[PDB]
Amino acid sequence: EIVLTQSPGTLSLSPGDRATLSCRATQSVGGDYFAWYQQRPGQSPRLLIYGTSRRAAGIPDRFSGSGSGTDFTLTIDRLEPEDFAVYYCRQYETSFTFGPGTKVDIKRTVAAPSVFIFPPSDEQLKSGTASVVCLLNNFYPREAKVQWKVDNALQSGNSQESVTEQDSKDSTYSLSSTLTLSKADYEKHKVYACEVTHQGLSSPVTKSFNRGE
Amino acid sequence: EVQLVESGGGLVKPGGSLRLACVGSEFTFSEAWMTWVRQAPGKGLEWVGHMRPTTEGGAKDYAAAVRGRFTIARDDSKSTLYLQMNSLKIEDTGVYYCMTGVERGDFWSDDYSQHYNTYLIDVWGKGTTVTVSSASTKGPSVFPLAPSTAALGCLVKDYFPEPVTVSWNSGALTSGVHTFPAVLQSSGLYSLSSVVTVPSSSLGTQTYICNVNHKPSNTKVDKRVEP
């Protein structure tokens, strides 16, 4: 039952930087039974290093594996564009799990999000449900906080969030928050506000609408 | 080229059964140590179980979460690895991969030499999708996300199963488009949002249609998003 852990979850670096990825085991894993994998969205995993330090055929020599016992390290000399992906360690001696994975994304300049709010459509309303959508568009870093306030009352438990993968064009993320209510609850209130805090925002940004208009 | 192909994935109800197959090629199948790995939507790789080479006794192993429900089998004569999945649960949903590490021969020659070599090839199949849900197939209702840089979009709500396709203006509009990953609602139905940013000057000039395609239900919806 050896458990593997990876630090950190997200490693933000610039193309050309040197990356150092950690994997730790609760008990020692023999050197011939440790491996590093790479996975990009929509694709199968790819072996990079096996037996702790052996590069797989066809893998560029900028990838390098090291470590012993319970401490293991994957090094990428210079991050190429195709290297921004998820990396998994793996053991295969007496336990056979993968590590939780480390995501390497592109360290970009800070970008505040563009915030938009969308009322429920009239078509959806006459079906008995109301979903109000808040869009945080093209921001960096990935950390963002959306809070719904209905007539100045903080909501909780009635919204779901979705975040895109890091954009392949400008290296930003985007986020949609959907607050879902019934017709009855929606027609009861007037001010629907989406309050956003992000590292690129000096103060919280609110986008709101009034149900009538 | 050594390869692996998975098949058998599909939509099944909780407590139902499913058998996955994995066909290998270009390696001595009887000597291969076979492994099943799975990946839930947006989650990491999870080891499911393996079966040692037949030539080593063929011992099997399983993850605690699937032990007693899943069985791994092997047919060397047909180069096929199997995964019998019983008592399926919703947390079994995901992509399932077949994987092994195999030996390959490398040969080169000089005016003065002949060199033979073996190296490892770690191979994975492209995966097969297992969806365990009690929901019924249903196309989405598409609601406009009306504007008034401007932002507009379409809300693709209450569909099952994955996936759904969204284009804007029949693919003519691709810059500024963000189609978010779906979220699974408490109803067991998926909901998704697709947005696009455009110049505010275009809101009265250009018309915007989101073209939504849900093949499992034979649903095509073209929704015009107006101010």
XYZ file of N, CA, C and O in Angstrom, chain B residues 93-181:
356
model
N -16.958 5.210 -14.034
C -17.039 5.930 -15.299
C -15.682 6.513 -15.680
O -14.966 7.053 -14.834
N -15.326 6.404 -16.950
C -14.080 6.982 -17.413
C -13.532 6.257 -18.624
O -14.157 5.364 -19.190
N -12.351 6.691 -19.031
C -11.625 6.048 -20.122
C -10.789 4.917 -19.541
O -10.145 5.083 -18.502
N -10.800 3.772 -20.204
C -10.045 2.614 -19.781
C -8.949 2.283 -20.772
O -9.204 2.110 -21.941
N -7.736 2.151 -20.270
C -6.582 1.858 -21.090
C -5.953 0.502 -20.828
O -5.906 0.003 -19.722
N -5.445 -0.053 -21.904
C -4.740 -1.297 -21.934
C -3.268 -0.888 -22.079
O -2.952 -0.019 -22.851
N -2.377 -1.491 -21.317
C -0.980 -1.115 -21.372
C 0.002 -2.248 -21.055
O -0.316 -3.166 -20.348
N 1.182 -2.197 -21.653
C 2.254 -3.148 -21.379
C 3.593 -2.510 -21.751
O 3.660 -1.458 -22.394
N 4.661 -3.151 -21.297
C 6.013 -2.835 -21.705
C 6.614 -4.038 -22.398
O 6.536 -5.152 -21.871
N 7.163 -3.852 -23.601
C 7.598 -4.977 -24.414
C 8.966 -4.695 -25.015
O 9.417 -3.549 -25.115
N 9.622 -5.778 -25.407
C 10.945 -5.736 -25.994
C 10.847 -5.596 -27.508
O 9.932 -6.131 -28.131
N 11.788 -4.862 -28.096
C 11.840 -4.640 -29.534
C 13.293 -4.726 -29.990
O 14.208 -4.361 -29.243
N 13.507 -5.253 -31.194
C 14.850 -5.411 -31.735
C 15.277 -4.234 -32.601
O 14.510 -3.733 -33.418
N 16.525 -3.809 -32.412
C 17.146 -2.720 -33.163
C 18.438 -3.221 -33.803
O 19.295 -3.790 -33.119
N 18.542 -3.081 -35.121
C 19.686 -3.569 -35.872
C 20.293 -2.465 -36.723
O 19.573 -1.762 -37.444
N 21.622 -2.347 -36.679
C 22.314 -1.447 -37.586
C 23.671 -2.036 -37.953
O 24.216 -2.901 -37.262
N 24.211 -1.541 -39.058
C 25.450 -2.047 -39.614
C 26.287 -0.888 -40.123
O 25.770 0.163 -40.496
N 27.594 -1.119 -40.143
C 28.636 -0.251 -40.672
C 29.288 -0.904 -41.884
O 28.948 -2.020 -42.277
N 30.286 -0.215 -42.435
C 31.193 -0.823 -43.402
C 32.057 -1.825 -42.641
O 32.656 -2.723 -43.237
N 32.109 -1.649 -41.318
C 32.909 -2.481 -40.435
C 32.144 -3.193 -39.347
O 32.790 -3.957 -38.599
N 30.832 -2.981 -39.217
C 30.113 -3.554 -38.079
C 28.695 -4.067 -38.328
O 28.081 -3.787 -39.349
N 28.225 -4.873 -37.376
C 26.834 -5.300 -37.255
C 26.467 -5.241 -35.786
O 27.140 -5.864 -34.960
N 25.425 -4.497 -35.448
C 25.047 -4.312 -34.057
C 23.597 -4.726 -33.876
O 22.719 -4.253 -34.602
N 23.338 -5.593 -32.907
C 21.974 -5.952 -32.552
C 21.691 -5.516 -31.124
O 22.548 -5.634 -30.241
N 20.463 -5.065 -30.897
C 20.091 -4.450 -29.641
C 18.614 -4.692 -29.364
O 17.809 -4.802 -30.293
N 18.257 -4.775 -28.084
C 16.861 -4.706 -27.685
C 16.645 -3.499 -26.779
O 17.538 -3.093 -26.030
N 15.449 -2.922 -26.875
C 15.027 -1.790 -26.058
C 13.565 -1.962 -25.659
O 12.814 -2.724 -26.281
N 13.169 -1.231 -24.615
C 11.803 -1.289 -24.099
C 10.872 -0.391 -24.908
O 11.235 0.722 -25.288
N 9.664 -0.880 -25.174
C 8.591 -0.070 -25.739
C 7.403 -0.168 -24.791
O 6.807 -1.246 -24.625
N 7.096 0.944 -24.138
C 5.936 1.088 -23.276
C 4.772 1.534 -24.155
O 4.834 2.598 -24.774
N 3.767 0.686 -24.266
C 2.647 0.928 -25.150
C 1.283 0.974 -24.472
O 0.988 0.216 -23.583
N 0.461 1.897 -24.935
C -0.881 2.115 -24.455
C -1.807 2.114 -25.640
O -1.435 2.503 -26.710
N -3.031 1.666 -25.437
C -4.034 1.717 -26.467
C -4.708 3.073 -26.394
O -4.513 3.832 -25.471
N -5.564 3.379 -27.342
C -6.177 4.704 -27.334
C -7.314 4.834 -26.318
O -7.728 5.964 -26.018
N -7.777 3.730 -25.741
C -8.761 3.738 -24.681
C -10.174 3.511 -25.195
O -10.499 3.759 -26.358
N -11.027 3.026 -24.300
C -12.449 2.851 -24.564
C -13.212 3.450 -23.386
O -12.728 3.430 -22.248
N -14.367 4.049 -23.655
C -15.060 4.837 -22.639
C -16.166 4.019 -21.981
O -17.024 3.451 -22.667
N -16.160 3.998 -20.653
C -17.156 3.291 -19.859
C -17.989 4.341 -19.141
O -17.462 5.121 -18.339
N -19.289 4.358 -19.414
C -20.191 5.322 -18.794
C -21.225 4.545 -17.984
O -22.078 3.858 -18.553
N -21.170 4.684 -16.661
C -22.115 4.023 -15.767
C -23.049 5.093 -15.219
O -22.647 5.936 -14.403
N -24.313 5.015 -15.617
C -25.288 6.010 -15.202
C -26.680 5.427 -15.348
O -26.927 4.589 -16.220
N -27.577 5.875 -14.480
C -28.983 5.507 -14.555
C -29.803 6.506 -15.365
O -31.015 6.327 -15.501
N -29.165 7.515 -15.946
C -29.855 8.512 -16.748
C -30.244 7.951 -18.116
O -29.665 6.982 -18.619
N -31.234 8.581 -18.730
C -31.656 8.187 -20.064
C -31.155 9.206 -21.085
O -30.891 10.366 -20.755
N -30.941 8.731 -22.309
C -30.401 9.576 -23.367
C -31.363 10.703 -23.696
O -32.561 10.477 -23.889
N -30.825 11.916 -23.782
C -31.654 13.095 -23.979
C -30.813 14.206 -24.585
O -29.711 14.481 -24.106
N -31.346 14.847 -25.619
C -30.708 15.973 -26.250
C -30.876 17.223 -25.414
O -31.792 17.332 -24.592
N -30.000 18.200 -25.615
C -30.039 19.404 -24.789
C -31.062 20.407 -25.292
O -31.455 20.421 -26.460
N -31.482 21.269 -24.383
C -32.156 22.494 -24.772
C -31.119 23.611 -24.738
O -30.331 23.711 -23.791
N -31.096 24.416 -25.793
C -30.073 25.427 -26.009
C -30.711 26.782 -25.766
O -31.633 27.176 -26.489
N -30.203 27.507 -24.768
C -30.723 28.816 -24.403
C -29.698 29.903 -24.710
O -28.502 29.699 -24.487
N -30.121 31.063 -25.211
C -29.154 32.115 -25.537
C -28.610 32.782 -24.286
O -29.310 32.927 -23.281
N -27.330 33.138 -24.337
C -26.697 33.995 -23.338
C -26.513 35.351 -24.023
O -25.526 35.586 -24.726
N -27.497 36.241 -23.822
C -27.618 37.446 -24.630
C -26.662 38.533 -24.142
O -26.532 38.754 -22.933
N -26.036 39.269 -25.071
C -25.096 40.332 -24.679
C -25.766 41.623 -24.225
O -26.969 41.638 -23.943
N -24.974 42.703 -24.166
C -25.368 44.045 -23.703
C -25.673 44.072 -22.210
O -25.198 44.956 -21.492
N -15.530 45.526 -26.057
C -15.687 44.075 -26.215
C -16.969 43.543 -25.575
O -17.204 43.760 -24.382
N -17.762 42.799 -26.348
C -18.989 42.188 -25.856
C -18.802 40.681 -25.725
O -17.911 40.087 -26.337
N -19.635 40.063 -24.891
C -19.634 38.615 -24.738
C -21.049 38.088 -24.920
O -22.010 38.684 -24.427
N -21.173 36.974 -25.635
C -22.455 36.308 -25.819
C -22.194 34.809 -25.880
O -21.045 34.364 -25.954
N -23.263 34.027 -25.823
C -23.062 32.594 -25.828
C -24.351 31.808 -25.922
O -25.428 32.356 -26.168
N -24.201 30.485 -25.749
C -25.305 29.531 -25.687
C -25.134 28.617 -24.484
O -24.032 28.122 -24.210
N -26.240 28.364 -23.797
C -26.273 27.457 -22.664
C -26.859 26.140 -23.151
O -28.008 26.097 -23.608
N -26.048 25.086 -23.097
C -26.406 23.768 -23.608
C -26.736 22.904 -22.395
O -25.849 22.330 -21.761
N -28.030 22.796 -22.071
C -28.446 22.334 -20.753
C -29.232 21.030 -20.822
O -30.087 20.841 -21.701
N -28.927 20.140 -19.867
C -29.696 18.922 -19.586
C -29.653 17.940 -20.761
O -30.676 17.563 -21.340
N -28.449 17.473 -21.055
C -28.256 16.466 -22.079
C -27.531 15.261 -21.485
O -26.928 15.335 -20.410
N -27.636 14.130 -22.180
C -26.966 12.909 -21.751
C -26.964 11.952 -22.924
O -27.962 11.895 -23.652
N -25.872 11.213 -23.163
C -24.595 11.365 -22.455
C -23.641 12.344 -23.158
O -24.020 13.002 -24.138
N -22.400 12.408 -22.675
C -21.353 13.078 -23.432
C -21.158 12.353 -24.766
O -21.428 11.156 -24.871
N -20.670 13.045 -25.802
C -20.336 14.468 -25.809
C -21.318 15.304 -26.604
O -22.215 14.783 -27.274
N -21.076 16.605 -26.611
C -21.848 17.517 -27.433
C -20.872 18.430 -28.166
O -19.801 18.765 -27.644
N -21.219 18.780 -29.400
C -20.404 19.648 -30.237
C -21.072 21.005 -30.388
O -22.288 21.096 -30.581
N -20.271 22.060 -30.288
C -20.747 23.423 -30.456
C -19.839 24.144 -31.433
O -18.621 24.190 -31.234
N -20.429 24.725 -32.471
C -19.717 25.629 -33.357
C -20.498 26.934 -33.436
O -21.675 26.993 -33.073
N -19.834 27.985 -33.918
C -20.446 29.303 -34.061
C -20.397 29.745 -35.513
O -19.333 29.723 -36.140
N -21.553 30.142 -36.038
C -21.685 30.588 -37.421
C -21.098 29.553 -38.375
O -20.338 29.874 -39.294
N -21.448 28.287 -38.119
C -21.048 27.152 -38.953
C -19.529 27.060 -39.089
O -19.000 26.694 -40.140
N -18.822 27.389 -38.009
C -17.378 27.301 -37.982
C -16.658 28.515 -38.515
O -15.423 28.566 -38.439
N -17.388 29.506 -39.027
C -16.747 30.717 -39.520
C -16.177 31.547 -38.381
O -15.210 32.290 -38.582
N -16.753 31.432 -37.187
C -16.340 32.204 -36.021
C -15.651 31.267 -35.035
O -16.314 30.454 -34.382
N -14.330 31.388 -34.917
C -13.555 30.562 -33.998
C -12.705 31.353 -33.018
O -12.374 30.829 -31.951
N -12.304 32.573 -33.361
C -11.515 33.382 -32.448
C -12.423 33.940 -31.365
O -13.540 34.393 -31.643
N -11.930 33.911 -30.128
C -12.689 34.342 -28.979
C -13.697 33.336 -28.470
O -14.460 33.663 -27.555
N -13.705 32.114 -29.002
C -14.671 31.103 -28.599
C -14.114 30.313 -27.422
O -12.965 29.858 -27.457
N -14.933 30.144 -26.380
C -14.624 29.267 -25.252
C -15.821 28.349 -25.052
O -16.917 28.823 -24.730
N -15.636 27.059 -25.305
C -16.638 26.050 -24.981
C -16.182 25.314 -23.723
O -15.195 24.567 -23.756
N -16.878 25.556 -22.606
C -16.424 25.057 -21.315
C -16.659 23.552 -21.182
O -17.564 22.994 -21.814
N -15.857 22.872 -20.362
C -16.138 21.458 -20.056
C -17.463 21.306 -19.322
O -17.797 22.089 -18.432
